């Protein structure tokens, strides 16, 4: 009985996280109506150029064609215009043996578990 | 459709070049023949097949093709009554195609495909599939052969097709996604086929002869070891299992082991009668044959081919019983190919990952429910075969760590031509202690009690006869001479099968109850005789031992009146004395 | 950011060939996948300026090389560790297989640990009675020590281990403090078991409602032979948390270890590298060394842990490189026979071959009884002098011995009959040394030559 | 009488196990159900903390 009420517990405690996952992707995915939209993807554009030295190609999607082109015109790169990706970018490195992608989604669960410590102790 | 060409041949290893992509343990089509080999060890685009046939007369250049899949077994209705070699094909379809020697290159399906199945369907439009639900049955022969979902395939049925007679390759369910379930289905040999949950076996493997149920049995869900040297039998154990037990189908895969074997069994089979449903036996075996002149790297498929057709069978619900013969060649096969692949090897050329290797064989076996809501069990035979005796051997070791039952057979007692020859000093069970309730209601009340002292007599005897060879017959007092010829009775009358009389090969579990009670009867009245002042050689020549003597050829039938009759003999035989 | 490589040059056996890869950290996790989205774990165990080599943590069917993506992740190999997981079931690479959410981890400890620092440890000096007669009198367990129990192929280990488990309490009244009773936290570490000795161990610790108090690093045989490795790190992580950050008396299990060592054999064999014994590396001291000797109890807090290794013997010796380098690094094992399992004794523990090296810092006065030590070396030598004339008596028969050299015959079978033999019963440290007592009062004085005077006049009888 | 009160015994103890058994499990699923339900409650209001941190810890 009283695994039964610690195991009803912490399954009651993990889905609200889920939950508070699932708002903040969604408020993740409708970043891209915002004013600072091409301030934050070319900031993570020149953070993704900055960690791979000196790349090559720039892979960025139909929609995220208009709003980098200076980029697209300095630091030696050559962009590459594909839909695989839902945020972010791609940063293609010497000869298509190393890539970079800096995606939102990728960021949020890759950092989710230290993050997820915080919010479970920002909400208890 | 990776397609390159043959860079390099090294033994039955070719080395193709030119796949780039191609996924590591599929099988690919070697040679412009059309050979069959596994893929393993990719480097820049650079393979290394291994063939399963021979591979003399090959040369640079033939096209290898790469099929892009795993290796693959067929699962449906039409396998029982049927031989296979180590890739699954029909050696009757081979023997009336190509002659009376196993050519290279053919490719014969593994179920016939156009033999006329009855169907009578079990779903209907608008219903839900999960893996591994029934979907109809098909009758194959006295079975009822209930045809399943493939283990990662759900949805909506859309379509079923009527009730009539059907053939193999035609798709009889179609869901509501645009796939088509047909009856049989293929499945990856190594992975391993999903279950819900585990069990734990507590019904017992009867296999028929007196001394590897009574004294070290074995459960349905459970695994167990045959070692021994040349000359102590084992195949006759082997056919014995596969010939009386009480498991619904056999899988009988046999991996480096001589045609003498095989052909006895498939020629014999058709002839007996399971003692379970009439009929043929031949319509329970599954066997798997690959002799030891046949190619040396199919000895790895061949048992993985076995278990993954006895899960398919234990899907079903059917009880199955696999019984593997020579894992050793198995391990030979694995040295072979290691030692070709240029690897270092550990204790005596065998490759490292090898006792990984029949863990993950002995880990099928077991009593699990299925994902059809049913419950089935599966349970593992393995012979080893050690060098001569040497029970340190890496192989014997590495599948004594995993096995629940070891049953060790000796040459010294078996070149007395005491068949069976299993040492009961080293072997043992651990099922012991959980087959006991099945025990006290269905063949007695105090039979673990019986047997523990069954246990003690064999324990005192085999002490005591050290000292019996170093002082000689005389210097035992009274009673120690009676703890030697019960203990002889036992081991001539008890543990000594034949397998080849009519009515001394099955031996259910009543009779042998029946037997032990009667030496374990004549031993407390001939102690309670002897602590009188009888001689004991007096007693040594009354007629009753010949009566308790000849009670392993007493029929099933004719036993219990015969019992009776025993036990009043040895009550109004010692009154006299 | 999630950095990828592609460009995989060879795939063999465990390992993988990753190039232009300057960024990958040595003793980094990597995660592999393919084209059909399964992910695989796996670690780097060379980094070069040219090229990497990658062991892969689980199956390696179905890589190719125009796909799988190498990612990093982890720049040193971590595990994520709370105090929530108490109760908690997880695979070999640390993920839980029993339907609940994933954890909130607190904090996040390197898995490989760092060595403990021998100015800050601290005797391990509290006597815990397990119930077992030979380990209570005779081969103390002290709280804080590592032993062994070396066992053969069909001995029971696994129910020994589960006893242990099931009664090990310390007893303060003896020692003279009181001051609460905490149980233990149970870390049960299982590598490559067959779901038979699964069953036991679930079963037993549910019956006895040990699972609210221990986590289970369950590896089971059809799961992957590499993770092996990282399965006693990761569990001894979670020890060395819950032991010396919260406080508990943690008891590790750790199941079957010639797995660990199998798995060692696998991955330095496939690395063409120098040999030992019986073809295990050379490094498997090093490894085996930074397993075990992560345990033990610290200065000035308050946790302990108590390791039992299991041990399969390959051909039941001592000689074999993996009970052989178990029995170097740790401090006594507990050693099993198969002669006394013959004869039905459970459990079958000789306690010749057998010892504990942390016995005299936690017996004796004012810790046990006044007798302790002096009655273990007196049920030592007599029982040898039974076992070395039982093979007189094999030689020459028994109607040439003379009375005295009957008594010692007498003493080994009753002491084998009722002071090792007990089914499943909790027999405590007064009742096993009055049983003790009662074997020794079948000899007679003057040849009790390691017990004092006083105790010899006011025990005997 | 000695196989009788052998019974009996077991009989009333059987019930009292099964009884006992069964009516402390209930209330332990009752109270699990209220401590579930209570710190779901107690999360819900406590929530949108967390999202705008998440949010500002994983953006630049």
């Known amino acids: 009985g009283e695994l039964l009420v610690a195991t009803a517990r912490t399954q009651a405690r993990g889905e609200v996280l889920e939950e508070v996952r699932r708002r903040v992707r969604e408020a993740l995915e409708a970043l891209p109506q915002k004013p600072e939209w091409p301030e934050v993807v070319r900031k993570l554009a020149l953070e993704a150029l900055e960690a791979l030295p000196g790349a090559k190609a720039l892979v960025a999607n139909p929609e995220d064609l208009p709003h980098l082109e200076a980029l697209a015109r300095e630091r030696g790169v050559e962009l590459q215009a594909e839909p695989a990706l839902r945020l972010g970018v791609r940063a293609v490195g010497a000869e298509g043996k190393t890539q970079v992608e800096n995606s939102l989604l990728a960021r949020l669960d890759r950092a989710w578990d230290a993050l997820s410590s915080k919010v479970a102790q920002a909400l208890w | 459709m990776i397609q390159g060409v043959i860079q390099k041949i090294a033994g039955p290893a070719v080395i193709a070049k030119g796949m780039l992509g191609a996924r590591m343990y599929d099988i690919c089509k070697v040679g412009e023949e059309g050979l069959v080999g596994e893929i393993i060890r990719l480097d820049g685009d650079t393979a290394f097949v291994q063939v399963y046939e021979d591979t003399s007369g090959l040369k640079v250049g033939e096209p290898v093709v790469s099929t892009g899949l795993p290796l693959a077994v067929e699962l449906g209705p039409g396998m029982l009554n049927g031989i296979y070699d180590g890739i699954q094909r029909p050696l009757e379809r081979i023997r009336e195609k190509t002659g009376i020697y196993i050519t290279r290159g053919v490719v014969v399906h593994a179920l016939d495909r156009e033999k006329k199945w009855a169907w009578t369907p079990m779903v209907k439009p608008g219903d839900e599939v999960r893996g591994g639900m029934v979907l109809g049955t098909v009758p194959e022969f006295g079975f009822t052969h209930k045809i399943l979902v493939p283990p990662d395939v759900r949805g909506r049925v859309k379509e079923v097709k009527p009730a009539g007679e059907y053939t193999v390759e035609e798709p009889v369910v179609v869901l509501e996604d645009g796939t088509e379930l047909k009856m049989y289905h293929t499945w990856p040999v190594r992975r391993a086929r999903p279950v819900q949950r585990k069990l734990d076996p507590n019904t017992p493997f009867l296999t028929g002869m007196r001394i590897l149920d009574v004294l070290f049995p074995v459960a349905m869900g459970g695994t167990a070891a045959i070692p021994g040297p040349f000359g102590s039998g084992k195949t006759v154990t082997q056919q014995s299992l596969a010939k009386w037990s009480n498991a619904d189908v056999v899988v009988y895969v ?13 020629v014999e089979f058709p002839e007996l009668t ?84 029949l863990a993950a064989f002995y880990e099928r076996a077991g009593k699990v429910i299925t994902l059809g809501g049913e419950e089935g069990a599966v349970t593992i035979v393995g012979a080893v075969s050690p060098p001569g005796g040497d029970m340190s051997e890496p192989v014997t070791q590495s599948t004594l760590r995993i096995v629940g039952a070891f049953w060790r057979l000796d040459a010294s007692l078996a070149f007395r031509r005491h068949f069976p020859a299993i040492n009961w000093n080293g072997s043992y069970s651990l099922f012991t202690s959980a087959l006991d309730p099945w025990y006290r209601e269905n063949v007695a009340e105090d039979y673990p009690e019986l047997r523990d002292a069954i246990s003690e007599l064999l324990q005192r005897e085999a002490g005591l006869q050290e000292i019996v060879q170093l002082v000689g017959p005389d210097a035992l007092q009274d009673a120690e001479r009676l703890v030697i010829e019960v203990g002889r009775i036992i081991r001539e009358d008890f543990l000594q099968q034949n397998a080849y009389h009519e009515v001394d090969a099955y031996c259910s579990m009543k009779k042998a109850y029946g037997i032990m009670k009667m030496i374990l009867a004549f031993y407390k009245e001939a102690e309670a005789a002897i602590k009188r002042g009888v001689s004991i050689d007096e007693i040594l020549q009354l007629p009753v031992l010949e009566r308790i003597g000849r009670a392993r050829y007493v029929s099933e039938e004719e036993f219990p009146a015969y019992f009776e009759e025993a036990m009043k003999e040895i009550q109004g035989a010692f009154k006299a004395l | 950011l999630k950095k990828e490589y592609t460009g995989i040059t060879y795939i063999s056996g465990p390992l993988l060939f990753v190039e232009n890869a300057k960024d990958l950290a040595y003793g980094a996790i990597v995660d592999i996948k393919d084209g059909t989205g399964r992910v695989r774990g796996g670690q780097v165990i060379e980094v070069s300026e040219e090229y990497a080599v990658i062991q892969v943590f689980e199956e390696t069917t179905g890589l190719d090389l125009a796909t799988t993506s190498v990612s990093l992740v982890e720049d040193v190999a971590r595990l994520g560790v709370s105090k929530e997981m108490l109760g908690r079931r997880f695979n070999g690479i640390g993920k839980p297989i029993d339907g609940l959410p994933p954890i909130t981890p607190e904090k996040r400890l390197p898995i490989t640990g760092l060595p403990l620092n021998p100015v800050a440890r601290r005797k391990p000096e509290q006597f815990i009675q397990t119930g077992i007669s030979t380990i209570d009198v005779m081969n103390t367990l002290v709280r804080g020590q590592k032993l062994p129990i070396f066992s053969g192929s069909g001995l029971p280990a696994n129910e020994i281990a589960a006893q242990i488990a099931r009664q090990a309490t310390v007893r303060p009244d003896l020692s003279g403090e009181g001051e609460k009773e905490e149980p233990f936290a149970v870390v049960f570490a299982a590598m490559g078991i067959t779901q038979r000795e699964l069953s036991y161990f679930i079963q037993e610790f549910e019956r006895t409602g040990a699972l609210s108090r221990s986590v289970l690093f369950l590896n089971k045989a059809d799961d992957p032979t590499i993770e092996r490795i990282l399965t006693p790190r990761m569990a001894l992580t979670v020890a060395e948390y819950l032991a010396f950050e919260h406080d508990y008396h943690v008891l590790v299990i750790l199941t079957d270890m010639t797995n660990y060592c199998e798995a060692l054999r696998e991955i330095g064999a496939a690395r063409e590298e120098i040999p030992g014994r019986r073809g295990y590396p050379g490094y498997m001291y090093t490894d085996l060394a930074t397993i075990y000797e992560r345990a033990g109890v610290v200065e000035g807090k308050k946790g302990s842990v108590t390791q039992i290794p299991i041990l399969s013997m390959p051909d039941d010796d001592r000689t074999h490189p993996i009970p052989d380098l178990t029995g170097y690094i740790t401090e006594g094992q507990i050693q099993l026979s198969r002669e006394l399992h013959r004869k039905g004794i459970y459990p079958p523990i000789d306690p010749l071959p057998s010892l504990s090296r942390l016995m005299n810092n936690g017996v004796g006065k004012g810790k046990t009884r006044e007798d302790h030590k002096q009655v273990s070396d007196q049920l030592y030598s007599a029982y040898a002098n039974g076992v070395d004339i039982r093979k007189l008596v094999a030689i020459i028969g028994e109607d040439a011995l003379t009375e005295n050299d009957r008594r010692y015959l007498q003493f080994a079978d009753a002491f084998e009959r009722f002071f090792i033999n007990q089914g499943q019963q909790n027999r405590s440290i007064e009742e096993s040394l009055q049983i003790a007592w009662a074997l020794l009062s079948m000899l007679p004085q003057g040849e009790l030559k390691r017990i004092s005077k006083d105790h010899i006049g006011k025990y005997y009888g | 009488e000695a196989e009788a009160k052998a019974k009996a015994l077991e009989a009333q103890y059987r019930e009292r196990e099964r009884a006992e058994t069964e009516a402390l499990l209930a209330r332990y699923r009752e109270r699990a159900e209220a401590e579930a339900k209570a710190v779901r409650e107690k999360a819900m209001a406590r929530l949108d903390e967390a999202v705008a941190l998440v949010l500002k810890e994983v953006l630049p």
């Open chain 2, 274 to 357: 399971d003692p379970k449903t009439g009929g043929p036996l031949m319509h329970r075996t599954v066997l798997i044959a690959n002799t030891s002149n046949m190619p040396v790297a199919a000895r790895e498929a061949s048992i993985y081919v076995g278990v993954t057709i006895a899960e398919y069978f234990r899907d079903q619900g059917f009880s199955v019983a696999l019984m593997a013969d020579s894992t050793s060649r198995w391990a030979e096969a694995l040295r072979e190919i290691s030692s070709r692949l240029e690897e270092m090897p550990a204790e005596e050329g065998y490759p490292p990952y090898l006792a990984a290797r």
């Open chain 2, 254 to 266: 046999g991996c480096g082991e001589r045609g003498n074997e095989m052909t006895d069994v498939l």
